[PDB]
Nucleic acid binder design. Sequence first.
RNA 1: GAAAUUGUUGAAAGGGAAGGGCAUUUGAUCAGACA
RNA 2: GGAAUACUGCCAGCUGGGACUGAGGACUGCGACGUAAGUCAAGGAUGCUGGCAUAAUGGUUAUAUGCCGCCCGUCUUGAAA
RNA 3: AGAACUGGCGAUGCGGGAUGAACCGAACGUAGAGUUAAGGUGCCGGAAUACACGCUCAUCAGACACCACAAAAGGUGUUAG
RNA 4: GCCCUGAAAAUGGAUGGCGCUCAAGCGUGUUACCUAUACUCUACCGUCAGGGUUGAUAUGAUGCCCUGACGAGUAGGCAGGCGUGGAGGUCAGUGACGAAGCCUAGACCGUAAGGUCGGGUCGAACGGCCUCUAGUGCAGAUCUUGGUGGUAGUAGCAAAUA
RNA 5: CGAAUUGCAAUGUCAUUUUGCGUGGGGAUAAAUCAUUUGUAUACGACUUAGA
Lengths: 61, 127, 106, 175, 197
Amino acid sequence: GIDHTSKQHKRSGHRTAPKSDNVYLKLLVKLYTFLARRTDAPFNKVVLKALFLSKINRPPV
Amino acid sequence: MASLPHPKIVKKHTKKFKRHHSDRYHRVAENWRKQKGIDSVVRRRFRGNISQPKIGYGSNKKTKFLSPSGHKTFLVANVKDLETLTMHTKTYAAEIAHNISAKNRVVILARAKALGIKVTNPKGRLA
Amino acid sequence: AESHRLYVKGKHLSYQRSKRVNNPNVSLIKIEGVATPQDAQFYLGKRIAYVYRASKEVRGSKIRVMWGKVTRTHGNSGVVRATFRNNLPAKTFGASVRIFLYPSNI
Amino acid sequence: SAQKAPKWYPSEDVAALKKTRKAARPQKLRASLVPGTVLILLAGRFRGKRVVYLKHLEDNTLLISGPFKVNGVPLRRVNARYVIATSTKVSVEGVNVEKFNVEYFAKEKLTKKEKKEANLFPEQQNKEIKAERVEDQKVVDKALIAEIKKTPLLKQYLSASFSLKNGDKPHMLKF
Amino acid sequence: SQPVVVIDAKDHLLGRLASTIAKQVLNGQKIVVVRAEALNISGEFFRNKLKYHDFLRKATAFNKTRGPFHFRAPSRILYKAIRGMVSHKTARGKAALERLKIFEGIPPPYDKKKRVVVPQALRVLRLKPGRKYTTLGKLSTSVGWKYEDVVAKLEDKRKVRSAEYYAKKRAFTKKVSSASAAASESDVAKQLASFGY
RNA sequence: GAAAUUGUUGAAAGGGAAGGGCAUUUGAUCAGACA
RNA sequence: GGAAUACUGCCAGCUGGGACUGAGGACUGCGACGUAAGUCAAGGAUGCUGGCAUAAUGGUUAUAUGCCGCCCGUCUUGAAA
RNA sequence: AGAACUGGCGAUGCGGGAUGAACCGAACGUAGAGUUAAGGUGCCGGAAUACACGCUCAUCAGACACCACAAAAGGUGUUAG
RNA sequence: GCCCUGAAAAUGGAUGGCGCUCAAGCGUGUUACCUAUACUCUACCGUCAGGGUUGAUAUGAUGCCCUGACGAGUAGGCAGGCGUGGAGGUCAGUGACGAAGCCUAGACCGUAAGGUCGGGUCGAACGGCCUCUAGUGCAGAUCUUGGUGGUAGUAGCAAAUA
RNA sequence: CGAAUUGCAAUGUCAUUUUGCGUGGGGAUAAAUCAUUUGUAUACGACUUAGA
């Protein structure tokens, strides 16, 4: 028995894939996962974590 | 066919997980149903009672879906379904479906003998 | 000349157990002639057979043997623990097993 | 189509093992087994017999020759665990044992797979003991009985056989 | 180590003998317990008689032929003691109590067999000298046994034959020992003595 | 042409219930042969 | 006055027996011993021998035996009730 | 009957207290090996009819806390002061 | 301090029972031993987290692989799946050389929901996968309808003269 | 004089009740229940009587 400090088996509350079924968004996530994995620039990680957002977290600019 | 890639297929809990009081009543079948009751000794996991399915009883992912002969059983219905197995012979085992007639079973068995595939029921409607 | 035996006779006492819970995988053997855990340490690792009868003459004979071995020493009075390939069938509680000397260190 | 196919069928040709690191070393026998001692055989056709230990072989077996003229146990191998090494010795320097090895006892027969069908006396190379063997067996005990007969009662000892009596506690009694 | 063990139950304590018997007979040993009417039991006689008259009260109220059966023989008092220490309601305990035979006096099968003594149950070794004790024959006679005089008439009749067997055997051993000293001087004995023998 | 329920045959068990869990003996049955 | 031993602690001291486990699957690493080639107990088991090739062995099932096991659903602070 | 803090039961199985929702130990995937807790080691019942110093003989002795009842008042009974 | 009296309640009874008296009781101390689902190590399942791999190999990164920690649970929430009646595609799927159904202490796969095969019976239609849709899963409701038990060859078949 | 080749271990089987068959070697020649009957008995069985 372990006296737990934190809640066990806790998912991170961030989506790691788009909930969309879009093929051309699946391809952009395939591209920017490669770029974020194999470059050192944080721009690609920002663009990759921004491709996952929903319609109300992607407001029009 | 050496068929030896797999190692020592063991099976934790080879018993059946029958339903509680399936042997007491005839209306209660032996298909497993979780006891949802509030005073259920099976649900509260007492000593001497039956055991329920957990994920702890899961099989080794290397030796899962394998027969004791070491292959994965794949249902065929004709020779064009046999041709999907002709380059995976040591890992799969063809099995003729239950509704194939006796005239077509002697065709499927001859094609599988010519291709080297192992059929797991070559004595069905044999006559 | 009248004797031929190369074993020590012992009894199958019981399963390894608590009060109210028994574990059938480990049996307790009382080796006749042993009194302490030191000098019960001599028989550790030796083979045990349980020889019994049947009626189906299989492989040319009617007597059958369940093999096992001594594993450790039990509490304070020369009882030992034993493990068999197929466990002993609990109707032999109080039945003669034979402890051989097959892995020897003498 | 009674079962549709896998996504792309990962092919499972055989793959070689990793490089092991288990190099075999010579056996380290227990110190009570010096050549010339008298062993009590505990298992087999000649169990209970008292033999003389002559040589350590290279399949980790002992070479014993209780004199055939004494108790009829020929030159053979035992497993060094199914023996009890007694205290008594003989002088084993007189015998010549260098012609014995594992190919001396290797059987050059052919019954190596058909023991499931060999059940009605096949008469295949089973009962021929030639003069290559008994001639070598004569010289190793004609020089061994001449050392056994130096001490009194040892020949009767080796001709007798071992058994446990009713009070014999083997953890207490010596050997 | 013997197949059947005959226990001369004179001067043994009841529940200290019954524990050793109930362990050996469960380990698998065939035990007969002979001369059970001379069993001792600690505590003074009126204390044990009051305990037995306390036992005599406990019978089934609505039908007395269902209740605890108060057996009055000494062999059956010792059998009640052993049966309380064996799990007699299972097949293992039922099969273990079939390896037991208890008699008062010594019956003619066991008249001519060697009797043993359990030393961890003897009144002499276990009780303090000066404590009062009870004999099971007198207690059984006081609670309603009927054959104390019969097993006492059949006992000295056995003791006469045993004491006239022992005189013949004693004369045999004196005739053996008067002539076995003629060989204790020779070379075989002087060689046997070095080996301890 | 299912089940409750019943008859016959066959197998087995049965000292005030029966059924169930862990383990093994014994009987039946099946397995692949490593062919 | 000289010791010894008990007790307590330490050893990167030596050595004997027993039990359970052998996961992973080309190579890569850190070490050790060697002039070197290399070798090794150093990122998880190999070598030799024998038996059976099926009543070997294993699965299911019925029974026997040892130990355990109160009748489910519900309301309830609390149900075998 | 009504409150204060904590722990628990409810929602919780497991080893122990014979049995018990609440006490002691300890909280739970499926197995193997080892070691223990609380409790025990005459027999049921796995484990010392161990070892050491004393006390008690009870014509309803006494023996695991919760806990399953016990006082005032006596006894030159025995022991110690 | 121990023991006794003081100490009385109703079926027969309870240190759990037998039993125990230089204890198997009481006070105290020293060891050895027994064993929980607890602790340690290993294997496997799952969940969570971290990291590697679009060299380009099965264009797939849904995956594959490396490492570590964790796993109780009612009311309840969520997720991944199994099963049913119909619908749109597809397997140029199965079938009178036997579809569906039903029986089967016969076999295999899955932790499980369940799936597959063999044998018997049977006689005209029915499945796999990608999706759509719902009158979609029962052990209970003194549930509805139908059918059948133990009681049980039992209670009884005895007023009105024969 | 023999025992080797059960091949480096595989209980390596020897004991004792039940039962049936076969050979030869003796030996012995019955009752109980139903049905009928009695009434010392009796709800029915049971009991107690009688009958070549």
